[model samples]
Target: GVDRDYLQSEYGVLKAGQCYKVVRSFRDYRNINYERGDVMRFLGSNFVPYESGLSLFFDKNGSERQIMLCVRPEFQMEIAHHLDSYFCKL
Candidate 1:
């Protein structure tokens, strides 16, 4: 089954427990940037932040990019390659 519990509000959609490869690109206010082709497993649910909207966190670049990026419309617009193999274990 496809998991579609992602967040959306006229911007874009963001799904948890899915692998997203940035097909385009994204720039947050000041957290981290999802450049083109950036791949990472997304993890979040009912994600609220200290000062943002629905959100998700990630350790991107494996370089201490522990992020709690507020779910953005740009996310769905740019990073929309949802490899949602929620059960495709290797």
Candidate 2:
């Protein structure tokens, strides 16, 4: 089950440079998870990218605080809801 309103509220008015980390809620066969409670640096901060293509940065709460590092081979969302939020919408 998914809630449309929550998605809208979360990304309705995204601020400029606002940190939005792309992280997958699930893991794979490798067990090398991205959002596995471990602090993985993608763009910067703890904000994981929503998609595996582009690398974005953010603070603990996804706020544009400082520098967001750039990295390749980013993470992808295994959850259907998250994918829909980024791809279907765009």
Candidate 3:
């Protein structure tokens, strides 16, 4: 069931089949910032730019967060328009 009280914030637990978009790639921020704070990044066994599945990541802000990563699909290029949503397990 959806927890009405906790469904309105970034970083909150994700429900089943929740959709998100990739604002930027994790590699895009692999510079100077990587050395700051405890960074939690997402990766995969064989994630390719245009030939493999993409890993997904979440950027929680204490309440609601944005989907940040995904698997590569056989379609258009120039970044993905939207990603299929998934559930967050404890």
Candidate 4:
């Protein structure tokens, strides 16, 4: 139940529904001169990465951000296999 046009428009991809982990996050501090470091609080959550150009989904709408991922090791292996197959196809 996914929309192809939306995926194309949003992520520039034909297929959808693949979530990834947020390894790190960046942000500016109070002084504006300093920036926050890699905040990996959500290191175990899965989120759909779309092509919004380049964005962190921070600021007022930060809650809309995909924080962490909770995927199994087997799932990761499956993903790796699929990626290898795709790479070969390409």
- Model 3 Cα lDDT, one tens digit per residue, 1-90: 223343323223333334333333323111211111322322111234654333234333333322233333432222333222223132
User: How far out, in Å, is residue 63 in model 1?
Assistant: 6.6
Q: Put down candidate 1 lDDT per residue, 1-90, tens digits, no spaces.
A: 113345331223444545556664555445456576677655443345444444444335553233334445664312323323211211
Which of the two, 2 or 3, has more lDDT? 2
Candidates ranked by lDDT? 1, 2, 3, 4
> lDDT scores for all predictions?
0.42, 0.30, 0.29, 0.24
Best by TM-score: 1
Superposing all C-alpha atoms, what RMSD in Å does each candidate have to the true structure? Answer: 8.8, 12.5, 12.3, 14.5
TM-score result, candidate 1: 0.43
- Clash count (model 4, backbone only): 5
- Tens-digit per-residue lDDT, 17-55, candidate 2: 333443334443233333523222222222345523322
Reference-based TM-score, model 3: 0.20
- The list of candidate 1 runs beyond 4 A from truth reads 1-12, 45-50, 59-90
True-vs-predicted CA distance for residue 25, candidate 3, Å: 14
Per residue, candidate 4 scores C-alpha lDDT tens digits across 1-90 of: 222232222221111233322222322111121122322111121234451122112111223332122123422322222332221110
Error of 1 at 36 (Å): 0.7
What is the Cα-based lDDT of residue 36 in candidate 4? 27
Residue 79, model 4: lDDT of 27
Best by lDDT: 1
Collision count for each candidate, in order: 0, 9, 12, 5
